[PDB]
Every structure is written in C-alpha cells, then in structure tokens.
Ligand binder design. Structure first.
Ligand code: TKT
Ligand code: TKT
Ligand code: TKT
Ligand code: TKT
Ligand code: TKT
Lengths: 212, 213, 213, 213, 215
C-alpha cells in the first residue's frame, strides 16, 4: 500500500532528476520570475559603533520551471514532494549590503509541486549596513536592504512580491527592538557598471528600542 | 564466530542500505510520527543586551520505518546496530526561534532496531530568542522555543512526546542558572502561508540565577 | 515551449562541450601567460580597530581574464553569446590580499559570467580584515592604509595584472558609514622578493578615510 | 632508488588490500566488543569564565584500540610493520566529552598509526569548552572541575574503556599558563542512565587548578 | 595561438602522467625518508592577550621537500621545468604547531609549485593563536615567547627537518603593528617522548617583541 506510494515518489524523482540533466538556470530566451517575501522575526542587535544591524527572518522564494512539471495521474496521484535544495536549481538571491556571510537557520529543503513550482523558505541571520541613529527615540531608526540576483539581470531574473507589507505577525514580542513598520518593494537598479538592469526587493524597516 | 557476526552485520547493512534506494521521506499516504523529548544540560548564558539565551541540551528523536525492519534470525541474531546519520533519512526538526545556527556537540550516529525503529540523540548548543528579565528574582524568568519540521505539515510529520516533563536529571548542578521548571508540549497550529496544520513541541523553561543560601 | 526546451539543450550542450569534453585549464605558464584585470568597488569601512591595527572593509573585487579554451561560435549554439556558471566549473586566478589578518569572508554567490570570446567576469563581494593603523582617523586629515592584491604563486611571467582605471569605484559606498572616504586608488606595482628571481605583480589599494562628522 | 620504488609499491598494495578490498569495520557489537585505551595529556587551561561557568582546555587525547581486520603479515608486504593513514580511511571510536558547551576544535592532523597486529594509535589534539565553575581559582586551595569522556552511542557491552595510568600526563603543560595545575587525574567509571538498561563507560578527568601566583 | 595550444597540451599531459598513471604517494617511511626544509616569515603580531596568555600571529611558512615520484625530463614535455598545482593533488607534510590554542586560519591559496627535479615549494600563510605569556611587553626588554613546529605523526626516521638559516625573515613585518619585533630565531631541535621509540623533529620559533614606542 505505502510501498506503492514510496515507489511512485522515487520513480518521479528519478524521472525528474536522474533522467533529465539539471536546469542550466534562466536565460534571456527562457527568463524566470521569482516571487520574494519576508517574515521578520527579530532585530537581535543594532551596533552603533560599526553601523551594522543583525536581523533574523525568513525569506519566501517561489518560482516555476516547466522542466519540473508532471502529471499526478501518471505517478500515483502525487501532487508535491519535498527535496534537498541541492537536487534542484535555486536562485542566487543575495543581500546587496550584507557585512558578514548569511547564517542559515533552517533545513535546505524545498517543496516541488506538479505544476513545476518550487517553494523554498530559508530562515537566516543577516548583518547588514544600517545606521541606528534615532533608535532611542519615539520616531526610531530607519534602515533598508535590497535583495536580488547577484549575477542575473532583469532579462533573466525578474522579481515580484505578492504584497508590499512585510509579515510582522511572527515578530518576537520581547525583542530589544519593536518594529514600527516594514515594507518590501520591487525596484529596478541601473548600475553605472552594467548596461543590463538588476532587479531587487527593498526591505525598509522602521524600528526603535522597546519602551512601554 | 566474531568474524561471522561481523559478516552478518556487514550483510544486513548492505541489504538495508545498498539494495533499495534512500527512503524519500514521508508523504500524506505514508505519514510518520516522530517522538521528541528534551534533556536540558545547561543554560550557559542569558544575554539581556540582545535577549538571546544559550542552552546545551539533547534532543531525543525516535521514529519507525518498515523499510528498516529485518528478521534477526536471518542475520545471526542481530537485533540492533549503530550507523552514521548520513546513512539514513532523518527528520528536519528545527528550532523556530533560533538566532544562530545550532552547534552539534555529539557524534552524528543513530541506533536502528530490527522493528525498524530509529533512535537519534543529538546533543547541541542553541541560541534562541529569550528575554531574561526577572532572572535575578525569586520568580525568575520564563522563555519558550518551539521545535518541529520546517517543511512537512502535520499530514506528513506528526509529533508526540512520551512525557510533558523535560528531563532534568543531567542538568549541570553548578550552572549559573537553576531550573525552576521545564515542560515540553505538543502543539498544532496554522500559518497564514499554508492550508495545512503544522505540529511542534514547545519547550518552556522557567529559570533564575543560582544564589548561595 | 519547445523553443524554450531547445534553448536549454543548446546551453546544456555548450557547457558539456567546454567542461566535460576536456580537462580544466591547467592555469597559465611562461609560454601562455595570462593577464587579469582587477578593479575594486568599496562598499563600507565597517570597523577600524586601534587596539589591534586591523581594519575591516566590505568591497567587490572585479576580476576579468580571457581563455582561448573558453571560446565558441555562437552560431553553433543557437546564438548563445554568454552564460553564468559556478566558479567551481572553471579555473579562477589565485588573487590574494597580501596583508590580511583573517580569512576573507565571501558575501556573494560564487558564479561567473563566461562570454563567447573566452572572456570571464567574476565579481566576488567580500569582507576583509587587513593590517592598518587607523591613527588620524578622528581628524580632518584622516588615516591612510594600503593593501596589495596579487597572485600568491604565479610570477609576472605567468600572471600579469592591470586596472582599467586607477580610481576605485566609490559609487556604491555606504552613505551612512561610520567612516567617510577621502580617497581610494588602485595601482599596479611590480615587486621583487628575496625568495625568487622573478618579479611578482600586485595591485595596491590605498584608502584615505576619516570618522564621519 | 629502485628499492624505494619497491617499498612505496608494497605500502600502496597493503593499504589497497586493507581498505579497498574489504569493507570498513562496522564498529563493535555485543558479540565482538572493543576496549579502547584512553589517556589525556593536558597542555593548557586557556580560559576560565566565571560569568558562564565554562573552562577552556587544550589537551591531547591518546586513543588506542585493536582490530583483527587491520592485521597483516609483514612478510607478505615487504617487512612493513606499521603505517600512517588518514583517520577517514578507518573506523574511529565516537569518544565524546559528556559536558562540552561548544564543538571541539581540532588542533592536530587527522592521521593515525596502524601497526601489523591490528592496533591503531590516534592522538587528536583539541580545544574544549566544558561546564566548570571556577569559584576559588583565585585562592590558594584553587578550584576543582570534572569532565567525562566516553562513547555517545555504544554501551559498556560494545565499547569498554581503560586507562594505562590514573595520572593525567602534565609533562607538556605550559609553564607560563594563567593557571597552574594542582592535580589532574583520569579515572574509569561505569554509569547507568534511566533511559538505558545498559551502562556506559567513561573516563572522568578531574582537574584541580588555581591562578598562577 | 598554436604555440600556446601546444604548451597547454604538454602541461596537461605532464600532470596526467604524474598524477593518474600512478597512485598518490603514500607519504614517507623509514625506508623512504624525507627532509622538509622549513622557514618562517613573520608579518604581524596582531594581538597579545594577557588574560589568557595567547598571542595571535600572522606569518607564512616556507616548506620545501623533494620526491623522486615527481621528477620528469623537461625535454619530454615541451621544456616545462615547473608547474603550479592544487595542494590536494599532492602529498604535503603534516607540519603542526605544538602549542596552538585554536585551529590555524589559512590566508593563502592552497597551491604549490612543482619543479622537474621533484622539488615542491609550498608557502601557507596563516593566523595562529599560540601559548604565550606577554609579561614585559610594555617594557624595553620586551616579552619572549616560543612555538615549535614539526610533524605530528611522523618521527625523525620518516620526516627530518632542516632550516636554511637561524634568522627568521622579518623583512615583510608590518611596520605599523601594535608590536615591534626585537628578534626572531628558528632552530631545529630533536625531541624524545615517552610514548615512542624514536624522536620527533621540530623547528623552534623564538620571538622577542614589545609594544611599539616612539623616538
Ligand atoms: C547585482 N550585481 C552585483 C553588483 C552589480 C550587479 C552585477 C554584478 O556587478 C558587476 O557586474 C560589476 C560591478 N562593478 C563592475 C565593474 C566592471 C564590470 C562589472 C562590474 C554583481
Ligand atoms: C514550519 N514552516 C516554516 C514557516 C511555516 C511552515 C512552512 C514553511 O513556510 C512557508 O512555506 C511559508 C512561509 N511564508 C510563506 C509565504 C508564502 C508561501 C509559503 C510560505 C517554513
Ligand atoms: C606573492 N608571494 C608569496 C610570497 C612571495 C611570492 C611567492 C611565494 O613565496 C615564496 O615562494 C617564498 C617566500 N619566502 C621564501 C623562502 C624560500 C623559498 C620560497 C619563498 C608566496
Ligand atoms: C552517552 N549517552 C548519551 C546519553 C546516554 C547514552 C546514550 C545516548 O542517550 C540515550 O540514548 C538517551 C538519553 N535520554 C533518552 C531518552 C529516551 C531514549 C533514549 C535516551 C546518548
Ligand atoms: C609530535 N607528537 C605528538 C606528541 C608526540 C609525537 C607523536 C604523537 O603522540 C603520541 O603518539 C603520544 C603521546 N602520548 C602518548 C601516550 C600513549 C601512546 C601514544 C602517545 C603526537
């Protein structure tokens, strides 16, 4: 009974991975749109001696590849499966103003659905460039960090959000810092280096030292 | 004789691991219950500048797979064996409010028994979100951290505990912090992101600074 | 959708032909020397530690070189003119900070852009602690420090370096840094060491900076 | 020159026969138990942190055991009596500090010595933080602490431990340490846990130390 | 174009001939012993912590040895006399600090230079924390500390060591370090241990240093 479902799932993964060579990533002729979102859990530290702030959050990443679709009826009605992020292509979404390598807090496992879509939710701790002047005031401090592909232009990787409101409903209630507001907004960057635009989602956080 | 038992173990492992492929993990039609329990060894530090607390504890993980069963009589009466956690599938049990990657303090080796049960006991150090206010009072401070699958819903991984009492019999007797109470409780919740419930075990610790008499 | 499928097979075939149908490039020799263009984009001076004389910089290191072994005719691969690939898939130059005090910490994906003429562009973002006395940083005149970059093991007969400009790119310098940049230059130098009879090449990064006020 | 060629050939053949022809030792069993000889050489107490009750030791661990599967006749292999090999080529015991607070940091190469009677010698140098209250370190009496080392997953029925002496080797203890050693002993102990019907064996390192005067 | 193509081919063939056509060198033995020439270049004393008696040093080690198994005739390979290769491609000696307090942090690419006579030059740069009491560092006489380097697992019957000079290279020492070096020596020694029937060889690096002053 369960033997058959296990066999079917193995067969599906072999047909998708071991049979077909890995996705070479997007191109101008085969571009990809990645949906990004942020769930802020904690501002751990705001360092005014170096202007770095440490955030704990997760990143919702979603995209769709035709090379990952399958007919459930042809695979025991399996409609999704979990797999190691190392078995699939994942986008190179990067903070543009980190000061330390990102520290990964969640399992590098993703969910693949029969329509070819992938959902990958990396939890992480990030130190980024942030002047916390005003954090000890009622108006608070405002910092910002952009997330995008490091190496793919908007012709290969476009980004989008499902909303411009950051999810603060999991934010730690006894953090040293309360969040006043947090937005997440698509932007188009034209850097002086590079003819091709680079797309990003800009996370803007207004925050202050917790005071009743 | 011992040469034989050694060959029997090598055979069993070859049969279990190298014959059928890796267990692809649970599915809604083949769901798995993971039994979780905690053994708290030390509250190492409570940082009020950041509201992070560092715990040293073990996490008892137990589950059972049909694909790991064998007949002991077909293998020289071997009833269990130890093996690298890399040789088997393991659940993606994750602290939901960690602030640093968890640091593993013990060997990544599991015990597999002939009924297909796996016992895995990783010791580790965790920093998590905790406001230690009141730690210097008679009432002490209270913090909590949930643990569960990151990627699997309750329809794929369920959790349970064998007791609601955290195991304190190995708690370091000269810690800077004394434990007032430690409980572990199964919870079910919905997140706005997904239509399925997710299961966690919530570790709640009440603690205060040790004082001399 | 077949056209998207075709474009993918073209890319998969090109990489297969460049990488898997030949052994990696063995690096440069006296007979086939390489020129690496180096350029720096200063993002932030994060920290200036006067107790240890170390300064920490966040910057991109632009690296560019060209190999005949990476050339292809786009017309034979459906007009594919460039592609992105893991820096592990190709040879990369061993460009090293000569006065680092800690291992460089990499902040961006290790992915390069390869073009049909055989040119490679690799732009790693990095945090570097290097040797620097920040005395004067809290004055109008400010502090001056310098760090040299070059091959560790190739002399100027095998790896030559150049810059496209002597001016460090400051267009991405963090506007609310603790430190403002008075000037930042990048200059090719040639050195002889006592060890070795051949000259080594480096690019010297000189940065003048002061506490923002 | 030719003879060195023969010697190298003989060693490569031995290693190939021991490692590539037969599978790796699956570890000890109830029917084929193993005794590991364990001893400690304490080099330094680096740090004692009274705010977290963690002490940091630098030491080496002497580990020795013997496997029939690693035996060979020297006459079959050009009179070779022993060799050095990566610890990855062989099974090693999962000897673990029961009260560490951070992952152990390895200071020496992961290479072991294998002798023709199947005995193995492995001497990992390490830095360990462990649970220790340094109260009294600033007195003439000093402070005492203890840390036990044993297998994480094998009971006394699979791995037994022994010591050649109960005296910790202090002959390489750093003479200018912040802490002088008053005593250091290593004692086999048998412990029962409520979790487990089988006892586990450990070597308990007890150190008495004080601030150098 | 065609001259460069050819030289690349010769090098590719040489490396294949050295690495794939025989298994990787099993290291030295009593019958096939090796001498490593060792030397130190000190770049910076970054930190001297008197709360724990640890000093942090950035330096590089010059390591040289020679193997018959890495020899070739340049005339057979387009007159190639040397090449650069990943240190993972070759055996390297397990030269270890005897009194480190933290793992070494590597600051240079792990690549060595191989020459047709079978000699290997490997120059690992690193930051080392080692056991060192800095008392007297705030005085004219300074502080003196020492750290030995040698093989961890091979005795003198398998790995011998030599220096080219007793004078540590201080020419590249960081001129604006918090600490000035008064002197640095590097001396071969023989150590006998109770564990083992034969002695182990080390180079003892002795450094006299003090807080930088003026005038
Ligand atoms: C997301 N991106 C990061 C920064 C901009 C965009 C693309 C990559 O940067 C570049 O290509 C260059 C930067 N500076 C340069 C100078 C000469 C050539 C290229 C670049 C990585
Ligand atoms: C234990 N889990 C963590 C958080 C909830 C549950 C499942 C995983 O989260 C998601 O799938 C999403 C979170 N936020 C989202 C937003 C849009 C789509 C998916 C998600 C990882
Ligand atoms: C950029 N480089 C670093 C330092 C100089 C140049 C080449 C490499 O060093 C050497 O080969 C030697 C240094 N000191 C030595 C002493 C004896 C033999 C060789 C060397 C690495
Ligand atoms: C050295 N060892 C460490 C601790 C005891 C011995 C064996 C391992 O622990 C267990 O199996 C359990 C601990 N607590 C438990 C609770 C339920 C089931 C098993 C255990 C790891
Ligand atoms: C450089 N070396 C370090 C220390 C001496 C030499 C060889 C290695 O040590 C041993 O084998 C033992 C030390 N102490 C012991 C006690 C019983 C058995 C072996 C050893 C590592």
């Amino acid at each position: 009974d369960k033997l058959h479902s296990q066999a079917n799932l193995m067969r599906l993964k072999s047909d998708l991975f071991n049979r077909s060579p890995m996705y070479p990533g997007p191109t101008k002729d085969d571009p990809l749109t990645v949906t990004l979102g942020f769930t802020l859990q904690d501002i751990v530290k705001a360092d005014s001696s170096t202007n770095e702030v440490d955030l704990v959050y997760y990143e919702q990443q979603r995209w769709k590849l035709n090379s990952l679709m399958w007919d459930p009826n042809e695979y025991g009605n399996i409609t999704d499966f979990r797999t190691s992020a190392a078995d699939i292509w994942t986008p190179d979404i990067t903070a543009y103003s980190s000061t330390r390598p990102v520290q990964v807090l969640s399992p590098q496992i993703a969910v693949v659905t029969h329509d070819g879509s992938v959902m990958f939710i990396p939890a992480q701790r990030l130190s980024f460039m942030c002047d916390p002047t005003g954090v000890d005031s009622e108006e608070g401090a405002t910092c910002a960090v952009k997330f995008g592909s490091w190496v793919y232009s908007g012709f290969e990787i476009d980004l989008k959000t499902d909303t411009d409101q950051v999810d603060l409903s999991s934010y730690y209630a006894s953090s040293k810092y309360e969040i006043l507001s947090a937005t997440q907004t698509r932007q188009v960057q034209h850097y002086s280096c590079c003819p091709e635009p680079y797309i990003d989602v800009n996370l803007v956080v207004k925050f202050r030292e917790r005071r009743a």
